Design a protein around this motif. Structure first.
Motif, PDB file in Angstrom:
ATOM      1  N   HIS A 241       1.004  -1.465  -0.194  1.00 52.10           N
ATOM      2  CA  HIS A 241      -0.072   0.214   0.133  1.00 52.10           C
ATOM      3  C   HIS A 241       0.884   1.235   0.030  1.00 52.10           C
ATOM      4  CE1 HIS A 241      -4.469  -0.989   1.030  1.00 52.10           C
ATOM      5  NE2 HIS A 241      -4.621  -0.921   0.334  1.00 52.10           N
ATOM      6  N   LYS A 242       1.189   1.763  -1.228  1.00 55.48           N
ATOM      7  CA  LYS A 242       2.052   3.278  -1.228  1.00 55.48           C
ATOM      8  C   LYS A 242       1.336   4.393  -0.033  1.00 55.48           C
ATOM      9  CE  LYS A 242       0.986   4.157  -5.668  1.00 55.48           C
ATOM     10  NZ  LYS A 242       0.485   5.534  -7.067  1.00 55.48           N
ATOM     11  N   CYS A 243       2.286   4.730   0.839  1.00 55.17           N
ATOM     12  CA  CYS A 243       2.337   6.108   2.071  1.00 55.17           C
ATOM     13  C   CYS A 243       2.912   6.471   2.019  1.00 55.17           C
ATOM     14  CB  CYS A 243       1.379   4.643   3.374  1.00 55.17           C
ATOM     15  SG  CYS A 243       2.668   4.096   4.198  1.00 55.17           S
ATOM     16  N   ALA A 244       2.259   7.995   2.593  1.00 60.47           N
ATOM     17  CA  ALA A 244       3.718   8.455   2.604  1.00 60.47           C
ATOM     18  C   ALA A 244       4.052   9.054   4.577  1.00 60.47           C
ATOM     19  CB  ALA A 244       3.249   9.945   2.507  1.00 60.47           C
ATOM     20  N   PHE A 245       4.914   9.057   5.172  1.00 62.91           N
ATOM     21  CA  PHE A 245       5.508   9.020   6.148  1.00 62.91           C
ATOM     22  C   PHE A 245       5.633  10.847   6.173  1.00 62.91           C
ATOM     23  CE2 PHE A 245       6.589   4.559   7.761  1.00 62.91           C
ATOM     24  CZ  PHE A 245       6.173   3.899   6.458  1.00 62.91           C
ATOM     25  N   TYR A 246       4.909  10.838   7.504  1.00 62.07           N
ATOM     26  CA  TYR A 246       5.182  12.744   7.843  1.00 62.07           C
ATOM     27  C   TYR A 246       5.960  12.448   9.334  1.00 62.07           C
ATOM     28  CZ  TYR A 246       3.589  16.756  10.629  1.00 62.07           C
ATOM     29  OH  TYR A 246       3.767  18.003  11.103  1.00 62.07           O
ATOM     30  N   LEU A 247       6.964  13.223   9.025  1.00 62.36           N
ATOM     31  CA  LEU A 247       8.245  13.647   9.780  1.00 62.36           C
ATOM     32  C   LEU A 247       7.886  14.025  11.695  1.00 62.36           C
ATOM     33  CD1 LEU A 247       7.422  15.794   9.049  1.00 62.36           C
ATOM     34  CD2 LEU A 247       9.492  16.769  10.289  1.00 62.36           C
ATOM     35  N   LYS A 248       8.328  14.328  12.234  1.00 62.07           N
ATOM     36  CA  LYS A 248       8.198  14.826  13.756  1.00 62.07           C
ATOM     37  C   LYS A 248       7.108  16.105  13.254  1.00 62.07           C
ATOM     38  CE  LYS A 248      11.457  13.324  16.507  1.00 62.07           C
ATOM     39  NZ  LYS A 248      11.744  13.787  17.959  1.00 62.07           N
TER      40      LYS A 248
ATOM     41  N   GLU B   1       5.230  21.773  11.284  1.00 60.66           N
ATOM     42  CA  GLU B   1       4.063  21.897  10.089  1.00 60.66           C
ATOM     43  C   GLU B   1       3.857  20.590   9.391  1.00 60.66           C
ATOM     44  OE1 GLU B   1       1.747  25.351  11.022  1.00 60.66           O
ATOM     45  OE2 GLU B   1       2.226  23.694   9.020  1.00 60.66           O
ATOM     46  N   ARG B   2       4.537  20.865   8.186  1.00 56.98           N
ATOM     47  CA  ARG B   2       4.838  20.046   6.788  1.00 56.98           C
ATOM     48  C   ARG B   2       5.429  19.220   6.911  1.00 56.98           C
ATOM     49  NH1 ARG B   2      -0.351  21.665   3.179  1.00 56.98           N
ATOM     50  NH2 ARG B   2      -0.205  24.276   4.201  1.00 56.98           N
ATOM     51  N   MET B   3       6.439  19.303   5.800  1.00 58.35           N
ATOM     52  CA  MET B   3       7.433  18.258   5.626  1.00 58.35           C
ATOM     53  C   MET B   3       6.971  17.025   5.558  1.00 58.35           C
ATOM     54  SD  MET B   3       9.931  19.394   8.279  1.00 58.35           S
ATOM     55  CE  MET B   3      11.052  18.193   8.771  1.00 58.35           C
ATOM     56  N   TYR B   4       7.727  15.940   4.625  1.00 58.53           N
ATOM     57  CA  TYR B   4       7.553  15.001   4.152  1.00 58.53           C
ATOM     58  C   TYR B   4       9.050  14.276   3.881  1.00 58.53           C
ATOM     59  CZ  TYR B   4       2.436  14.085   4.478  1.00 58.53           C
ATOM     60  OH  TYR B   4       1.244  13.822   4.498  1.00 58.53           O
ATOM     61  N   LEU B   5       8.905  12.388   3.972  1.00 55.41           N
ATOM     62  CA  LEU B   5      10.301  12.067   3.929  1.00 55.41           C
ATOM     63  C   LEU B   5       9.971  11.323   2.221  1.00 55.41           C
ATOM     64  CD1 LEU B   5      10.976   8.980   5.887  1.00 55.41           C
ATOM     65  CD2 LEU B   5      11.883   9.031   3.928  1.00 55.41           C
ATOM     66  N   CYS B   6      10.992  12.135   1.317  1.00 59.64           N
ATOM     67  CA  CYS B   6      11.193  11.702   0.219  1.00 59.64           C
ATOM     68  C   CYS B   6      12.551  11.749  -0.394  1.00 59.64           C
ATOM     69  CB  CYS B   6      10.838  13.003  -0.570  1.00 59.64           C
ATOM     70  SG  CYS B   6      10.152  12.712  -2.308  1.00 59.64           S
ATOM     71  N   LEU B   7      12.501  10.504  -1.554  1.00 62.38           N
ATOM     72  CA  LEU B   7      13.906  10.535  -2.013  1.00 62.38           C
ATOM     73  C   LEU B   7      14.316  11.506  -3.191  1.00 62.38           C
ATOM     74  CD1 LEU B   7      14.092   6.399  -2.901  1.00 62.38           C
ATOM     75  CD2 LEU B   7      15.887   8.279  -3.790  1.00 62.38           C
ATOM     76  N   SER B   8      15.496  11.833  -3.413  1.00 64.29           N
ATOM     77  CA  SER B   8      15.528  12.290  -4.460  1.00 64.29           C
ATOM     78  C   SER B   8      16.738  11.744  -5.834  1.00 64.29           C
ATOM     79  CB  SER B   8      16.034  13.491  -3.904  1.00 64.29           C
ATOM     80  OG  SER B   8      16.112  14.706  -4.950  1.00 64.29           O
ATOM     81  N   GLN B   9      15.618  10.597  -5.814  1.00 69.36           N
ATOM     82  CA  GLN B   9      16.550   9.390  -6.980  1.00 69.36           C
ATOM     83  C   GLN B   9      18.091   9.653  -6.306  1.00 69.36           C
ATOM     84  OE1 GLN B   9      14.277  12.378  -8.754  1.00 69.36           O
ATOM     85  NE2 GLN B   9      13.231  10.973  -8.181  1.00 69.36           N
ATOM     86  N   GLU B  10      18.616   9.868  -5.283  1.00 67.51           N
ATOM     87  CA  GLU B  10      20.009   9.789  -4.965  1.00 67.51           C
ATOM     88  C   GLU B  10      20.047   9.245  -3.500  1.00 67.51           C
ATOM     89  OE1 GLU B  10      22.975  11.115  -6.734  1.00 67.51           O
ATOM     90  OE2 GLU B  10      20.760  10.169  -8.121  1.00 67.51           O
ATOM     91  N   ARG B  11      19.864   9.922  -2.833  1.00 65.66           N
ATOM     92  CA  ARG B  11      18.956   9.590  -1.015  1.00 65.66           C
ATOM     93  C   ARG B  11      17.784   9.970  -0.021  1.00 65.66           C
ATOM     94  NH1 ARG B  11      24.890   8.150  -0.466  1.00 65.66           N
ATOM     95  NH2 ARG B  11      25.166   7.139  -2.414  1.00 65.66           N
ATOM     96  N   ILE B  12      17.834   9.979   0.497  1.00 64.98           N
ATOM     97  CA  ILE B  12      16.593  10.087   1.680  1.00 64.98           C
ATOM     98  C   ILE B  12      17.134  10.838   2.157  1.00 64.98           C
ATOM     99  CG2 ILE B  12      15.058   9.867   3.593  1.00 64.98           C
ATOM    100  CD1 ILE B  12      15.655   6.997   3.037  1.00 64.98           C
TER     101      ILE B  12
ATOM    102  N   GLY C 202       8.352  10.460  -5.587  1.00 63.63           N
ATOM    103  CA  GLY C 202       9.630   9.624  -4.595  1.00 63.63           C
ATOM    104  C   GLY C 202       9.102  10.155  -2.906  1.00 63.63           C
ATOM    105  N   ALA C 203       7.895   9.921  -2.766  1.00 66.36           N
ATOM    106  CA  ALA C 203       7.693  10.092  -0.992  1.00 66.36           C
ATOM    107  C   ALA C 203       6.908   8.411  -1.002  1.00 66.36           C
ATOM    108  CB  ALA C 203       7.311  11.266  -0.501  1.00 66.36           C
ATOM    109  N   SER C 204       6.360   9.029  -1.781  1.00 60.70           N
ATOM    110  CA  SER C 204       4.653   7.327  -1.774  1.00 60.70           C
ATOM    111  C   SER C 204       5.237   5.860  -2.242  1.00 60.70           C
ATOM    112  CB  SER C 204       3.815   7.653  -3.437  1.00 60.70           C
ATOM    113  OG  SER C 204       4.470   7.125  -4.387  1.00 60.70           O
ATOM    114  N   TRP C 205       6.191   5.622  -0.612  1.00 63.20           N
ATOM    115  CA  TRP C 205       7.138   4.126  -1.025  1.00 63.20           C
ATOM    116  C   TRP C 205       5.427   2.998  -0.468  1.00 63.20           C
ATOM    117  CZ3 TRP C 205      12.068   5.299  -0.051  1.00 63.20           C
ATOM    118  CH2 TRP C 205      12.918   6.506   0.297  1.00 63.20           C
ATOM    119  N   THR C 206       6.084   2.165  -0.713  1.00 60.83           N
ATOM    120  CA  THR C 206       5.426   0.958  -1.172  1.00 60.83           C
ATOM    121  C   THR C 206       5.835   0.219   0.351  1.00 60.83           C
ATOM    122  OG1 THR C 206       5.109   0.735  -2.760  1.00 60.83           O
ATOM    123  CG2 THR C 206       4.404  -1.522  -1.701  1.00 60.83           C
ATOM    124  N   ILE C 207       4.379  -0.156   1.111  1.00 64.23           N
ATOM    125  CA  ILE C 207       4.670  -1.357   2.258  1.00 64.23           C
ATOM    126  C   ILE C 207       4.968  -2.589   1.764  1.00 64.23           C
ATOM    127  CG2 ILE C 207       2.662  -2.061   3.159  1.00 64.23           C
ATOM    128  CD1 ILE C 207       5.458  -1.022   5.191  1.00 64.23           C
TER     129      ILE C 207
END
Lengths: 218, 424, 19, 55
Positions: free
Chosen positions: B260-267, B270-281, B301-306
């Motif tokens: 299930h594709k899902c995004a991860f909210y950091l601390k 405000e907003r932000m998110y965990l994303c992959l920039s075709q290089e690193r996290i 790039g932030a819709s990782w699959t579980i």
DNA sequence: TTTCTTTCCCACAGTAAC
DNA sequence: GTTACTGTGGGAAAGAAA
């Protein structure tokens, strides 16, 4: 400890005149030990002095569990003869007393528990009922009793393994016979779509295979 | 051919000293996507097969010390799908300490509800090693993107288990990058993937280390924390949110399901998110919130699959030099209970793949053994006098190591240790 | 809820954000 | 004690007899299984060494 | 009929070999 | 560049379970 050193090795009636204390290593109560070391006399006085006969040690086993594992016929009777004692007690892995009685091949202990009205179709944390282990250990005698006293002959554990399956895998000809006699379904594929005839053909237990092909068919 | 030899007394002491256990290992997703027609939906993450242990090397040296090329001592291995009539794809373990099968796939022909990866293994000189399997794998016709009821588990991730999260760019199998760790940071190497604990933290959680987790399944919204199952380093408090159409939702109590594709909210910022920039996290923000105050569109790039990964493990040792027969299967011991005590002290073991040609060793002492079944065994605790020429009754707590030893010499290091306690 | 899993934190970019 | 001891002697005996039957039944099939296994190992080692030449 | 689960279908979009 | 392909992901289609 003081009441545990004289109940495991008028040494129980004088001190009681601590009771449910669990050690640090085994975490067993005076009752457990008195049951494991098969100290009939001591075990009795322990119950008379009103003691919880269902306390669990560091592994979830009750004084009764130890009674069977230690084949303490004496302490055993005393426990199954007590109303409070839980017959369908379960260890941390779902191991029930009835099961242990069919595993360590003990004398009668099984039917005794079954007669005292104990859930025959009890399952461990894996789904294996008492009848299952009786098949894996080729315990025909116990297998017959578990059956005559109503037991899901085609019950499947978590891996969808039927009693007959484990009998075919382990190569329990004697038990495989019995199960087949009681018109047990032989076409029950496990979670991997394998018939008891396959696992048997794999282990190369030609005997079991021969039965699954001609014994009590249609 | 030299007939098998009973692992001699002295032989054990040697092992107990060295202990260079040769151990295979496997990692895989508890679930797999079935490919229809002539399609080919590979296994993602790709089933890896590490070969940990110091013994592995000691085997190389021992083999060459008897005439073996860098090729004749190089452990080879293949991998297949249970009892399927397909071809066991090979693995390239040259120089590497592992190897992933980035092309394993199951067709819709195999009407099996479950199955498990088979790993044939043998040295360069066709010296048989054995067949190591992995835990079961459920077959899904498609990840239920629909609602999920907490009635049919196995598909629902639980707090504590391990998982894997990857990323697919523009729908290309060549891009796919998995969440990995090394050097001290969180990469995204499309060459490696790792299992990450997914503990469930109550909304009232603190900062980080020395925290507390609580049982229960995971639904989008809960404050979960992903810890590296290996290195240990983990990402600060995160909140998983169900995503779809490049939009990370904020209102989704649904239970997280497999694939299930899902995004991860950091601390709790405000907003932000965990994303992959075709290089690193790296960090992001995903500020667009025009649709709904609860639907914060997130950059791709932030819709990782579980996916929940498992782990098989087998460890052994050639306690008596090479053997004509494979070291497979590998006897595993999960439970070790003591039956009775004193003069009749006996031990009942329960695990898997137990064989009648086995015996338990209390340290350097071989104790009689009784084969109950494939997952049960009974041995006899040897008198304490077998460890103390001076006593006839436990005078002091003596802890000896437990271990399973076959008849041809092969020894399987357990981990459990039986201890002699003074009879009260 | 009685257990406890320790670890080792690591923050990529913009850590002070949480405040 | 002589009455219960008998109960013990008989139990251990039965367990030992079981092990004897199983181990013997396992070792008996050893060849049939061991040979069939190596037969599969050969078929693969052939492709493992042949796939090395095409390198 | 509704509600999913299982099967088919098909088009982005990179790969590989000319 | 041009061709011949191919995992992937989203959606239409057919059953099968409410």
């Amino acid at each position: 400890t003081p009441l545990m050193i004289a109940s495991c090795s008028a040494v129980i009636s004088d001190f009681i005149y601590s009771l449910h204390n669990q050690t640090d290593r085994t975490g067993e109560t005076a009752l457990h030990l008195a049951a494991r070391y098969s100290r009939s006399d001591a075990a009795k006085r322990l119950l008379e002095a009103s003691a919880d006969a269902n306390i669990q040690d560091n592994m979830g086993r009750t004084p009764l569990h130890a009674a069977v594992s230690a084949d303490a016929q004496g302490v055993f009777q005393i426990l199954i003869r007590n109303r409070a004692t839980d017959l369908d007690a379960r260890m941390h892995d779902g191991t029930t007393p009835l099961i242990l009685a069919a595993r360590l091949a003990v004398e009668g202990m099984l039917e005794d528990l079954i007669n005292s009205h104990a859930d025959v179709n009890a399952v461990d944390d894996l789904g294996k009922s008492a009848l299952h282990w009786a098949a894996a250990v080729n315990n025909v005698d116990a297998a017959v009793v578990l059956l005559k006293n109503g037991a899901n002959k085609d019950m499947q554990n978590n891996r969808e393994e039927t009693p007959l399956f484990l009998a075919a895998r382990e190569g329990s000809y004697e038990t495989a016979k019995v199960l087949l006699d009681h018109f047990a379904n032989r076409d029950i594929t496990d979670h991997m779509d394998r018939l008891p005839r396959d696992i048997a053909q794999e282990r190369m237990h030609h005997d079991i295979v021969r039965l699954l092909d001609e014994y009590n068919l249609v | 051919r030299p007939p098998p030899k009973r692992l001699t007394r002295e032989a054990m002491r040697n092992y107990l000293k060295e202990r260079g256990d040769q151990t295979v290992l496997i990692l895989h997703a508890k679930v797999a996507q079935k490919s229809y027609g002539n399609e080919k939906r590979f296994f993602c993450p790709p089933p890896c097969v590490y070969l940990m242990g110091s013994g592995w090397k000691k085997k190389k040296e021992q083999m060459e010390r008897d005439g073996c090329s860098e090729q004749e001592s190089q452990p080879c291995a293949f991998i297949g799908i249970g009892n399927s009539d397909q071809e066991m794809q090979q693995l390239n373990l040259e120089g590497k300490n592992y190897c992933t099968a980035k092309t394993l796939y199951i067709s819709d022909s195999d009407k099996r509800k479950h199955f498990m990866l088979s790993v044939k293994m043998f040295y360069g000189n066709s010296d048989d090693i054995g067949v190591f399997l992995s835990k079961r794998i459920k077959v899904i016709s498609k990840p239920s993107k629909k609602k999920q009821s907490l009635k049919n588990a196995d598909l629902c991730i639980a707090s504590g288990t391990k998982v894997a999260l990857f990323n697919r760019l523009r729908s290309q199998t060549v891009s796919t990058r998995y969440l990995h760790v090394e050097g001290g940071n969180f990469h995204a190497s499309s060459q490696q993937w790792g299992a990450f604990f997914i503990h469930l933290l109550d909304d009232d959680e603190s900062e980080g280390e020395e925290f507390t987790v609580r049982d229960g399944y995971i639904h989008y919204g809960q404050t979960v924390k992903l810890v590296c199952s290996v290195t240990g380093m983990a990402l600060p408090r995160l909140i998983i949110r169900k995503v779809d159409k490049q939009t990370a939702l904020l209102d989704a109590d649904d239970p997280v399901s497999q694939l299930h594709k899902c995004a991860f909210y950091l601390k709790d910022t405000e907003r932000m998110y965990l994303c992959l920039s075709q290089e690193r996290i790296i960090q992001f923000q995903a500020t667009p919130c025009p649709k709904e105050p609860n639907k914060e569109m997130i950059n791709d790039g932030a819709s990782w699959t579980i996916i929940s990964t498992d782990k098989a493990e087998y460890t052994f040792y050639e306690g008596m030099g090479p053997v004509l027969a494979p070291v497979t299967p590998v006897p595993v011991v999960e439970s070790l209970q003591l039956n009775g005590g004193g003069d009749v002290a006996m031990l009942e073991l329960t695990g898997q793949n137990f064989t009648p040609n086995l015996r338990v060793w209390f340290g350097d002492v071989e104790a009689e053994t009784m084969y109950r079944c494939g997952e049960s065994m009974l041995c006899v605790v040897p008198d304490i006098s077998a460890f103390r020429e001076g006593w006839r009754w436990v005078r002091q707590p003596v802890q000896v190591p437990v271990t399973l030893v076959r008849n041809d010499g092969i020894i399987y290091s357990t981990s459990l240790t039986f201890t002699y306690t003074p009879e009260p | 809820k009685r257990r406890r899993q320790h670890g080792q934190l690591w923050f990529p970019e913009g850590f002070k954000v949480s405040e | 004690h002589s009455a219960v001891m008998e109960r013990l002697r008989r139990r251990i005996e039965l367990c030992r007899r079981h092990h004897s039957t199983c181990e013997a039944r396992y070792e008996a099939v050893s060849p049939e299984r061991l040979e069939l296994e190596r037969q599969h190992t050969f078929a693969l080692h052939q492709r493992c060494i042949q796939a090395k030449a095409k390198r």
